[PDB]
Design a protein around this ligand. Sequence first.
Ligand SMILES: O=C1COc2cc(C(=O)N(Cc3cccs3)C3CC3)ccc2N1
Ligand SMILES: O=C1COc2cc(C(=O)N(Cc3cccs3)C3CC3)ccc2N1
Ligand SMILES: O=C1COc2cc(C(=O)N(Cc3cccs3)C3CC3)ccc2N1
Ligand SMILES: O=C1COc2cc(C(=O)N(Cc3cccs3)C3CC3)ccc2N1
Ligand SMILES: O=C1COc2cc(C(=O)N(Cc3cccs3)C3CC3)ccc2N1
Ligand SMILES: O=C1COc2cc(C(=O)N(Cc3cccs3)C3CC3)ccc2N1
Ligand SMILES: O=C1COc2cc(C(=O)N(Cc3cccs3)C3CC3)ccc2N1
Ligand SMILES: O=C1COc2cc(C(=O)N(Cc3cccs3)C3CC3)ccc2N1
Lengths: 128, 126, 130, 127, 131, 123, 126, 120
Amino acid sequence: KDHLLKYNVGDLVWSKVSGYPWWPCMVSADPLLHSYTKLKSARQYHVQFFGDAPERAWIFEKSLVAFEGEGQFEKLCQESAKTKAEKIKLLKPISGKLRAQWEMGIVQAEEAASMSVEERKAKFTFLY
Amino acid sequence: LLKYNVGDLVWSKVSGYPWWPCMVSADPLLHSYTKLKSARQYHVQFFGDAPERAWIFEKSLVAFEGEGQFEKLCQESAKQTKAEKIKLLKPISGKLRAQWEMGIVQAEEAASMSVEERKAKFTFLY
Amino acid sequence: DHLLKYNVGDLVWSKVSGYPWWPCMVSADPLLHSYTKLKKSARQYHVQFFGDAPERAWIFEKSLVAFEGEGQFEKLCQESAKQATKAEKIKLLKPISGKLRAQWEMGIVQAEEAASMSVEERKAKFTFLY
Amino acid sequence: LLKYNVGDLVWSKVSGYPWWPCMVSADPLLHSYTKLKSARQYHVQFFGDAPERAWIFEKSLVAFEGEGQFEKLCQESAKQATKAEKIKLLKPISGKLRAQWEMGIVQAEEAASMSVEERKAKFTFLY
Amino acid sequence: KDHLLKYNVGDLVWSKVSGYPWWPCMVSADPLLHSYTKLKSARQYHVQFFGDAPERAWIFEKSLVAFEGEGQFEKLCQESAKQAPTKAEKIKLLKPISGKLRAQWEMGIVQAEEAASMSVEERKAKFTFLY
Amino acid sequence: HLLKYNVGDLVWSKVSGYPWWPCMVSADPLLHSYTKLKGSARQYHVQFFGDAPERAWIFEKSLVAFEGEGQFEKLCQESAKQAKLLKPISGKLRAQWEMGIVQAEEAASMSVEERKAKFTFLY
Amino acid sequence: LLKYNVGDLVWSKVSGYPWWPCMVSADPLLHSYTKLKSARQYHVQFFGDAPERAWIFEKSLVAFEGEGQFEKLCQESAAPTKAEKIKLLKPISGKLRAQWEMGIVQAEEAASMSVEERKAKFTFLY
Amino acid sequence: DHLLKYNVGDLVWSKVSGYPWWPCMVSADPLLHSYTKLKSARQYHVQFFGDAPERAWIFEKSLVAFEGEGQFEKLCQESAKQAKPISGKLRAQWEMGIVQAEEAASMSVEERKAKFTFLY
Ligand SMILES: O=C1COc2cc(C(=O)N(Cc3cccs3)C3CC3)ccc2N1
Ligand SMILES: O=C1COc2cc(C(=O)N(Cc3cccs3)C3CC3)ccc2N1
Ligand SMILES: O=C1COc2cc(C(=O)N(Cc3cccs3)C3CC3)ccc2N1
Ligand SMILES: O=C1COc2cc(C(=O)N(Cc3cccs3)C3CC3)ccc2N1
Ligand SMILES: O=C1COc2cc(C(=O)N(Cc3cccs3)C3CC3)ccc2N1
Ligand SMILES: O=C1COc2cc(C(=O)N(Cc3cccs3)C3CC3)ccc2N1
Ligand SMILES: O=C1COc2cc(C(=O)N(Cc3cccs3)C3CC3)ccc2N1
Ligand SMILES: O=C1COc2cc(C(=O)N(Cc3cccs3)C3CC3)ccc2N1
């Protein structure tokens, strides 16, 4: 039973990886391990990072926030900012290649959000 | 409120072919798994070493439990044209028998799994 | 391009001897990169056959009809049968079965979804990779 | 009544990169080639041996004619730029990036010698 | 663990499928199920059919013969025709292959003989068909 | 210097039950050779041109250098005299044969190096 | 008489990287899994979501039992150079920590399998 | 083709600014289908050998016929006089290239084209 977890396959989330901005993702099954959640005492979910160069990872629930839209990003940065060096880095706006790919991810996540979970699973699940 | 959902294992009947082990899946292009053609259809994937897919009517689908169902499925389809009946009861041979067998082995391995895991393992890429 | 009857992305029905009128999309040859040619004296267009098992060919304009929807198929069969050899007519009127019926149906579903789209969007969604 | 269409060859400017030869294309997933963010963007593919793609603002696009435009593009982007930004913009590309930029230019010039339909059939990167 | 069976992954065998000639094969793991042998009371092995259009199947041990070379094929046909109780089956079994199937059978033999000239490890790395 | 054909050469190939088909001499994707001796009698690895490409090891006796489509009629008439063969191809096979001819004629208009880079089917 | 064979799980040390979960494999082009350079090397595949491969010296390989070995591997590797030691003891972060973690998860799942099954499941396609 | 210094399948060392002399093979552009061009100065399209293959159009002046690994030391010393040993990921991939190039060198041009031409 999946009806008992906070997130399920196809759910849109923001993921935080140290040294990267909060990123638009979808919860998905590991292409090899075929699981989407696991315990490490602490729950993790397998996610896919939206964009033109897709990546994937096992991210802790503590580092996930349900995706509603782009408007959440500012508060996510301000809350994550609140190490002295880490704060100055977190508040700084993204540039170059990473800004383009982050933008590409948001466009994909917002398109995915306008869909039922089944359709977005069939359209946005990245093949590996 | 639908009889089947993505990941459900079914037997599908296509005229001129034996009842085949399948899984209900989303269409790779249309991203839907069910549609109305007044009469409901489901998109399915045919299990085997040479996978295929199709939009099959609900009337031509039966929930998959295991291989043991096949004999009754043949006998019921045969009872439901004199030439059609003799063809339906005849056991499969050669390439088709091997691929049918391969499908059953895949479907039974899929059946031993939770729906989420079987979707992640057995959904054929297109 | 604005001077030819058909262009890349246009939906057409194609007739190949021994097959039913099939839902297609005019497309560029994956290798030759042309979508129309003269065989020049007679014009041909490269088409992709819609379905779960996609195929492609260079089809003569005489064997192409602009696709509007499934409702045209009956008249296409009846007109092709009247134009046809006594054996050819009986074959043309006979309804498709098995694997071919399923794939023809799959093509129709794809063609009708493609028809509900702007040419640019349908080229980006329905052009089969080769 | 839009400035660019699918298959049009453009130069794109991405912060930290030289003006790059591109072709306007449809997003492989979203199937659109232009969108509004009040400000118009176009989906482009970056030419070269390691292809990439992005949604670039119209203000950061210039119609591609040939390699000869690049010098003026650098000099105009430098004049429009922060003292540090100008010194960086005028500096010539080297190593892997110079090779890939060169590869893109060769592809873009070969694409330019073709009718829009033929270049779409040959140079649209598969994703 | 895998030291007790007649065949192992990478072993070259001839496989008999009803309606087809004895075909050059390699024993291999199922690309999805990751097993190379199973019991159905009767043992089966997963094989890949050599040729330009590769295929795969689960074949019963009774329908497998260790591959030494092309020279075995004549005796295999001869033994198959003698074991076939049906008169029609025998005439079919002795008939030589033609067209596309003859070419692909030939292609398989060429691949199998190349594979035979290699150590098991090397032939697994070169001839295992990707799926 | 003694072989009639080399990688990239355009040939017509005859396979029993099929019309003379537009081909190109190529290396085997696995065996990496383009010619061999079966036994006494030389074979060449070829790739059949068309929208559904295939490949095979064909005997030299079943190969004829490709110049163009105009050769096909004489090839049929000569194969018929040496022997169904005279009957014209239809349906799917006629379309794919036509597709092969179009590919072979485009390949013929190119230098050997360019045609190897463009028309060698990936496997 | 070789220490490792195709399918064996090992930890590999590449200068500037943490000890990484690998599996011994045949080179996809050269079809060999071990060679001499005098000194023996093995072809390995680095486990993770972004797989890589390399020819690694036997001296830089340690048989993989599980994640619990990593701490002692770091402490033993921690190097005559003073700068090298401080770098080696420092814990991995960001993208590399995620991919290292992904590799461990894959290596531990591979370890729970018979050599034949793990070669069929975890040999990365090239 | 019989008139140029290099042809498709020939093994060469390539020099790209900021990289060590790298074991390569002359090949046709997967898109442009040419293997040499003039830019007054001749270039050849090459593929860099290794586990992560790359390709580029390199000037003839930056190419040297590949005989074996033993040439590398002199190539560095000559390139330094005209103007540090490789480590980590790059050292491994360079090593992987040498192994591939030396295997390719032991083969006839035809066979090495069929085995070592990287698909794109
Ligand atoms: O198009 C895209 C989508 O994915 C990206 C991930 C990354 C990216 O590097 N990461 C970190 C990773 C952890 C595990 C693997 S990758 C994620 C942002 C946090 C960078 C650029 C990307 N571009
Ligand atoms: O490995 C496999 C799995 O799929 C098959 C389908 C078929 C097969 O031909 N069909 C009919 C089809 C209808 C739509 C497309 S395909 C299905 C059995 C009913 C034949 C062999 C197969 N082998
Ligand atoms: O999914 C599909 C779509 O394409 C098909 C083509 C055919 C099919 O065979 N044809 C004939 C062809 C012309 C040249 C190559 S293929 C077309 C119907 C006219 C059969 C089944 C198909 N199923
Ligand atoms: O062969 C190529 C073509 O594309 C490249 C893009 C880049 C490259 O990194 N960029 C920035 C990007 C923004 C969005 C995704 S990529 C483009 C130059 C501006 C670097 C090298 C490349 N090499
Ligand atoms: O290149 C090849 C190799 O494989 C083939 C298998 C077949 C072929 O059809 N078979 C029967 C099969 C059973 C299971 C799947 S396929 C095998 C010969 C017995 C036909 C042609 C082939 N050509
Ligand atoms: O597009 C194409 C090209 O290749 C074909 C080969 C065949 C085809 O079946 N053959 C026979 C073969 C022998 C070895 C493998 S294939 C060749 C014509 C003689 C049929 C249709 C094709 N369509
Ligand atoms: O998912 C993964 C798995 O492989 C990686 C290798 C590397 C990685 O860069 N290396 C060094 C290499 C040497 C030869 C080629 S790659 C290995 C860790 C030592 C970095 C990140 C990875 N992420
Ligand atoms: O496996 C490999 C082979 O190719 C490489 C190229 C490079 C590499 O970056 N280059 C520079 C390039 C110029 C054009 C595109 S790439 C070449 C060494 C000079 C780095 C690592 C590699 N690893």
